[PDB]
Ligand binder design. Structure first.
Ligand SMILES: Nc1nc2c(ncn2[C@@H]2O[C@H](COP(=O)(O)OP(=O)(O)NP(=O)(O)O)[C@@H](O)[C@H]2O)c(=O)[nH]1
Ligand SMILES: [Mg+2]
Lengths: 78, 167
């Protein structure tokens, strides 16, 4: 079994495969948006345990110390 | 607020489970193959004049994620058992999904539809009569679909909701 992160979104969840924890949060966001929304509304990721704060998209998954995130439209809240 | 139906799409890798789900939810055909681990999609729909919420679970066909079946099989309220009409091994694999649903539900009573997908393709290796006979042996409907053309897609998912409503 590969590693993967859970992304909670407005209309369900997606499990996103990751090759390692050096992947950036930006890559995960892009994969989650493409799958769930398709082809400009903007989105953030939040750690599951820290509502209303955008994670740094340039940081690595490993630096988050978390495996579950919320995908939130920037003009909205979880 | 409204009634929610937990529908689960199962079947071998590559048969079009994700494409069927996205064609239903977003009216869009996904041309690329990105293998699923697990994804859920919720959408409000009207079926036979009555509004409800569909909660569709798109599952992994890849055997490396087979351990997750137990969980989603327990709470799934109806199942699309999908094979591809140009893939005889995916047709052979249908029975294994049904048997696992039986181990955790203690029966196969659960609403289920046998779905033969990719019917837009010219080359077929699963005969229609063979799929009809399999569905008859299970006592469930057989519906031919194409996630590409949308043929049969609403019929497949809505048949599950109708079967749940009529229990
Ligand atoms: N022509 C045609 N291609 C289809 C159809 N449904 C799916 N495909 C194609 O088949 C490939 C696999 O589809 P996908 O839905 O990802 O398969 P899956 O069953 O979800 N695979 P997995 O179990 O790995 O998640 C994709 O290239 C998709 O475009 C269909 O009805 N017709
Ligand atoms: Mg898939």
């Amino acid at each position: 079994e590969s590693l993967f992160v859970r992304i909670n979104a407005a209309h369900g969840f997606s499990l996103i495969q990751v090759d390692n924890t050096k992947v950036t949060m930006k890559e995960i966001l892009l994969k989650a948006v493409k799958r769930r929304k398709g082809s400009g509304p903007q989105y953030r990721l939040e750690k599951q345990s820290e509502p209303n704060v955008a994670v740094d998209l340039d940081s690595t998954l490993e630096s988050q110390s978390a495996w579950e995130f919320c995908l939130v439209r920037e003009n909205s809240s979880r | 607020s409204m009634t929610e139906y937990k529908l689960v799409v199962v079947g071998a890798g590559g048969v079009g489970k994700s494409a069927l789900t996205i064609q239903l939810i977003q009216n869009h055909f996904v041309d690329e193959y990105d293998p699923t681990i697990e994804d859920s999609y919720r959408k409000q729909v009207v079926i036979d004049g009555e509004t409800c919420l569909l909660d569709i679970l798109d599952t992994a066909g890849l055997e490396e994620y087979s351990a997750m079946r137990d969980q989603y099989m327990r709470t799934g309220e109806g199942f699309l058992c999908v094979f591809a009409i140009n893939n005889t091994k995916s047709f052979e694999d249908i029975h294994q999904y049904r048997e696992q649903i039986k181990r955790v539900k203690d029966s196969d009573d659960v609403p289920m539809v046998l779905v033969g997908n990719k019917c837009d393709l010219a080359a077929r290796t699963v005969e229609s009569r063979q799929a009809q006979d399999l569905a008859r042996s299970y006592g469930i409907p057989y519906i031919e679909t194409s996630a590409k053309t949308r043929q049969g897609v609403e019929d497949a998912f809505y048949t599950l909701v109708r079967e749940i409503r009529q229990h």
